[PDB]
Amino acid sequence: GIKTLRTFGRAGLMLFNALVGKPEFRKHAPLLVRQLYNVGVLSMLIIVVSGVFIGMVLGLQGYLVLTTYSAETSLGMLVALSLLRELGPVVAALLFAGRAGSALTAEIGLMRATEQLSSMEMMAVDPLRRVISPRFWAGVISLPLLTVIFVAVGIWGGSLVGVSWKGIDSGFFWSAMQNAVDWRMDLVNCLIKSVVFAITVTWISLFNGYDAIPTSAGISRATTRTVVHSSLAVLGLDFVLTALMFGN
Amino acid sequence: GIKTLRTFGRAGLMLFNALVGKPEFRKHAPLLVRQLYNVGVLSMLIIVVSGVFIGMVLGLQGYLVLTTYSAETSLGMLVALSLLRELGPVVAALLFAGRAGSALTAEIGLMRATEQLSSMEMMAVDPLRRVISPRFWAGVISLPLLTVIFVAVGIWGGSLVGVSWKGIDSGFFWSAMQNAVDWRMDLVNCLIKSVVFAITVTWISLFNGYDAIPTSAGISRATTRTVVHSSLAVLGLDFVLTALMFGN
Amino acid sequence: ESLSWMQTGDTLALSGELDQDVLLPLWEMREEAVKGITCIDLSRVSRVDTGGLALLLHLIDLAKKQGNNVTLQGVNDKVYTLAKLYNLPADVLP
Amino acid sequence: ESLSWMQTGDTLALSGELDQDVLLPLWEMREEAVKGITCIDLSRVSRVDTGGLALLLHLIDLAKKQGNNVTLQGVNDKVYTLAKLYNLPADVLP
Amino acid sequence: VANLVDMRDVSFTRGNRCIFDNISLTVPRGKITAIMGPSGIGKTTLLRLIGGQIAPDHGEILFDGENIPAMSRSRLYTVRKRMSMLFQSGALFTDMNVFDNVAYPLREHTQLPAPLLHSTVMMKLEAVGLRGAAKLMPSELSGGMARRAALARAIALEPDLIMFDEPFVGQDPITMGVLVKLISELNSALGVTCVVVSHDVPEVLSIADHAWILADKKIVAHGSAQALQANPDPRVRQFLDGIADGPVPFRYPAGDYHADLLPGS
Amino acid sequence: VANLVDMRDVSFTRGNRCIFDNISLTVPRGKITAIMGPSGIGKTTLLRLIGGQIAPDHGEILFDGENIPAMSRSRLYTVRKRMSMLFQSGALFTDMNVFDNVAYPLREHTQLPAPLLHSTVMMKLEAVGLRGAAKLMPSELSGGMARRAALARAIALEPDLIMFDEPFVGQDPITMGVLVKLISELNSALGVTCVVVSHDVPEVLSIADHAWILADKKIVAHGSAQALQANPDPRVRQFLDGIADGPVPFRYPAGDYHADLLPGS
Numbered sequence A, B: 001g002i003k004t005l006r007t008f009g010r011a012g013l014m015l016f017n018a019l020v021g022k023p024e025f026r027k028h029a030p031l032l033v034r035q036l037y038n039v040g041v042l043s044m045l046i047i048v049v050s051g052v053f054i055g056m057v058l059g060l061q062g063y064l065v066l067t068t069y070s071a072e073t074s075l076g077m078l079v080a081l082s083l084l085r086e087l088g089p090v091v092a093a094l095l096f097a098g099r100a101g102s103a104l105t106a107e108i109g110l111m112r113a114t115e116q117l118s119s120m121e122m123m124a125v126d127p128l129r130r131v132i133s134p135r136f137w138a139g140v141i142s143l144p145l146l147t148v149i150f151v152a153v154g155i156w157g158g159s160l161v162g163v164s165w166k167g168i169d170s171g172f173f174w175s176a177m178q179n180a181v182d183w184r185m186d187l188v189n190c191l192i193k194s195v196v197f198a199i200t201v202t203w204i205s206l207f208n209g210y211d212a213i214p215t216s217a218g219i220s221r222a223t224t225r226t227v228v229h230s231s232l233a234v235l236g237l238d239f240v241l242t243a244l245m246f247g248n
Numbered sequence C, D: 001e002s003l004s005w006m007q008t009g010d011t012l013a014l015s016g017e018l019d020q021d022v023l024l025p026l027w028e029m030r031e032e033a034v035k036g037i038t039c040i041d042l043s044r045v046s047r048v049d050t051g052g053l054a055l056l057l058h059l060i061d062l063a064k065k066q067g068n069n070v071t072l073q074g075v076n077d078k079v080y081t082l083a084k085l086y087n088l089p090a091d092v093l094p
Numbered sequence E, F: 001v002a003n004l005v006d007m008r009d010v011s012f013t014r015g016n017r018c019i020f021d022n023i024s025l026t027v028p029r030g031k032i033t034a035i036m037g038p039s040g041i042g043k044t045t046l047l048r049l050i051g052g053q054i055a056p057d058h059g060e061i062l063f064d065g066e067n068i069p070a071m072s073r074s075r076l077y078t079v080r081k082r083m084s085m086l087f088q089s090g091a092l093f094t095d096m097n098v099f100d101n102v103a104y105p106l107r108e109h110t111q112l113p114a115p116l117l118h119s120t121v122m123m124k125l126e127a128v129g130l131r132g133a134a135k136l137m138p139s140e141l142s143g144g145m146a147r148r149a150a151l152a153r154a155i156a157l158e159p160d161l162i163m164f165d166e167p168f169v170g171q172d173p174i175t176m177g178v179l180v181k182l183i184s185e186l187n188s189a190l191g192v193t194c195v196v197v198s199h200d201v202p203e204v205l206s207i208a209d210h211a212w213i214l215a216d217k218k219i220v221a222h223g224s225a226q227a228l229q230a231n232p233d234p235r236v237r238q239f240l241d242g243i244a245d246g247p248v249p250f251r252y253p254a255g256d257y258h259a260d261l262l263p264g265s
């Protein structure tokens, strides 16, 4: 009943009333840049630092498996092609739904609590087209770039393990092997997942803040509701996308 | 200065004043069970459903790599020994810091905001020894069990892919190969990481709620502060633990 | 600090503080304590707190359990003040 | 709905609504509009809003920029009411 | 027209707990009216209802003629440029400071030039009083200064109906006095018709020209601040001075007190 | 002893903004005293300071003899069994219902048997009034019923000093009246010595026997509710009736108004 169609229809309506409408551009450009700084630039530290660690692990736990199979040169093909096909777009979606997927619901649900959104709508300004949409377009263009930064630092960390720790190969690691890895179709299959996860993370991270019960115990339950659903949906959409992108 | 020692010393003091003290047992047993239901049983759905998906992926993206190497029997050794050595204790720590690592700070920081903790301390009851400690011991004994449930359902999902999808092996998948995998030392190396991550997740998820600025915009910033630090620290402690557990 | 009840005929002469602290020993044998006691006399009782008032309520109820028209003598003004606070009906305290 | 200013000697006879809406065209040539104008007469002005009051402040300031003792005639009571609200000092409005 | 908003017959439900039931209200222009009820009576919903942000179930609410509920939602913004809610907590935008918080409805609608808009905002701040707080962020402001800054931001555009949702709630009498002098000086200088919904009677009745009192789910009394404090009606006579016991029950309903006292007698 | 808490000379800082500065206060037992100041004056910190939950920088606060600041922190709990803060918002434990919320300090300390504790709690609820709300969760309660349930939970153990942190703030006069009749009926029935800190003067002075008024960072006036409303002191005469303009400045400090009006004249 309730979750049957009420919540989904309302969470789709708050988006069809937040993207399609007046084509205002040069009034939102000052908002889109600040929302890029909030949702995209601030969160960068949580995806750079946690990009090296999930990188250095990916090498250190992989280097000790390939070594048993006498193929330590494929390490670059193992680190990159893993944190660029599966782990990149999903780990940087989880760490996004954490840092910038809850700071959105704890923000646009905190506005709704202090009657900030209704005070916007009490002018002529639409609360959706002015508060939702800048944050939405800041979410769906910062995540597909955050995953790129995350994959870059992940490959650098994998190098820091498979090169700086066990100095067996300085250029055989990536200068020769990753050339057969870093091809276009792989980055495309990574960016598709990054964009779909950006949409799904920042749509249910921007709806729980808009559909929260306006109280300190309603926004703080919706915050965790986004961190939960924006991990369930990330993993589920990841399985579906992987079935479609490699199950052929 | 501030983060130098003030925050760490205070976050260690709020624990040395929350575990060592009166040995009260049969008064907390009614609290420990309810905190196990809140922090451990409620979160189960987010680690079962997101245990299958990270499982079915682990097979589906791994089955298509081992098949290129003509070794499709090692799939059980690939799924299990991966989501039981590296991905299990870390993914179920991230999904824990999400569901039950923010619902703790949005709760024990919401109490502190409505003056609930000071109203406890206004009786003789210590707010730490009565609110912190049950939640702490519910966190550090629900996570090492949630990771076990998560690994179990992950292996089941990996089977659902490598057996139900491509019906190539019904018993060669695990009935023969995983016997050389599921050995004791592996589960021990998984439970060690699960316990250290439980301590680190539920110690900084229980401190941000205790050190939050008591306001709807302070608890909602501390909530995201836990989801950030309890992923940075999980990944970092994971790298350190993996260096110590396999870098030998 | 002290509490002591004596069955002295048809009277339950209790004396002490009758509060949340010294209330324990009287609660157990409350049945035999008010077995054949018609009126309860709480005169040598310095003060009475809410818990003691609850115990007195239960003693009265037990006196009426087996069936006995109970009466209270020697009560303080403070006890009836405290009972007027809690709006205790006139058919449970008398 | 309408606004029109006429330089008619030493007087800036502006007439209209003088509000946030019709204020645009007057703001641009404000310099030459008050070039050689000693007193500004806003008599045929039905109402005046806060934005119009700000524009009038700036016109006065420009009249004193090149140096000219300005005076206001034909103003309404409502304008001076609104100016008493905003606590406008007596050396900027006169 | 005579009155600026004539709520002829509004019935609002909000689920199952019927909030209002065929109420009638009439705010005359230039007059600062007030509506009072117990806490949690639904009176803020009345303000949110006369701003078109929520629909009456069976109601004809006429804002200066045409109905509010039957509006294109594109015309409703044009008329909503002639209203101004002053919520509790101010509803100040935490992004920008006070200056960019008052200037917001100006930049949104009017094309005032930059040095014109600066002089308009730095004048409305002086009107309200917190002109020195132009560059102070709205999370640095006090509890009462936030309502004052939101008032300054609310009188931008000269809205001809600025309604106050509990402007003095949990405020010291010294800031209650500032907030009661501001919203009287405005009505006595501007032509705004303040609708002050509140329940802090001693201060609201000091300015209200014609106040309504709404009981559980309907309006029970109206009249001026003088003919109201003499009303001989228990539901109103209790609330007007808070006698703590009357038609509203002091003791929450309970059962027999005896099984509650001695369970299983 | 004469007075139940004698705060002889307390100076509190809290960082750099010095809150108090050599203040003196004396709550006599059996007397319901009050302290009033503007909002954000630091008066709730005074209550949190006489409960030992925060230390005075240079202060001798004597709760019935011995100091509060110089306590083992194990003895402080024994004396803290003789205090009871009633915070705003009630501070009700959202886990358990009202019944298990009032019974909490009983089960924590006393060994009352189950049918004894049930009769004690279902009597203190009737004392306060919300006995029918025994099984209602504290998030289902109203805004004023939460303070009443927390009052019932606060008078458990008969604390001999139950201090109220703003018990009537943002409450209708009809619930303000219930809350002002409860905390007078308690003092006139129990021997509790209520310390009602607040700033809603018209209602607090209706019961307070000896009230203090603290200015910016020090106590400026005291005396009974009668000798206070006649005090000839601007800092006190302003606050006691809220004249909106006096020694506290209405206009927040600003610069010259001219560069603010015409930037770059």
Ligand SMILES: Nc1ncnc2c1ncn2[C@@H]1O[C@H](COP(=O)(O)OP(=O)(O)NP(=O)(O)O)[C@@H](O)[C@H]1O
Pocket: F014, F015, F017, F019, F038, F039, F040, F041, F042, F043, F044, F045, F166
């Ligand atoms: N944790 C804190 N750290 C520093 N200063 C504080 C803190 N809590 C309160 N203060 C300051 O202490 C003073 C008084 O405290 P506060 O309890 O806010 O005052 P109050 O007016 O008595 N309470 P209230 O009106 O209910 O908000 C104010 O200047 C506060 O800013």
Ligand SMILES: Nc1ncnc2c1ncn2[C@H]1O[C@H](COP(=O)(O)OP(=O)(O)NP(=O)(O)O)[C@@H](O)[C@H]1O
Pocket: E014, E015, E019, E038, E039, E040, E041, E042, E043, E044, E045, E166
């Ligand atoms: N979605 C909702 N569902 C149910 N009640 C609601 C909802 N939104 C607001 N309310 C409340 O609105 C009604 C009217 O009270 P409310 O709007 O909270 O303000 P008030 O009671 O007039 N004053 P106050 O709450 O002190 O600001 C209550 O009976 C509640 O129903």
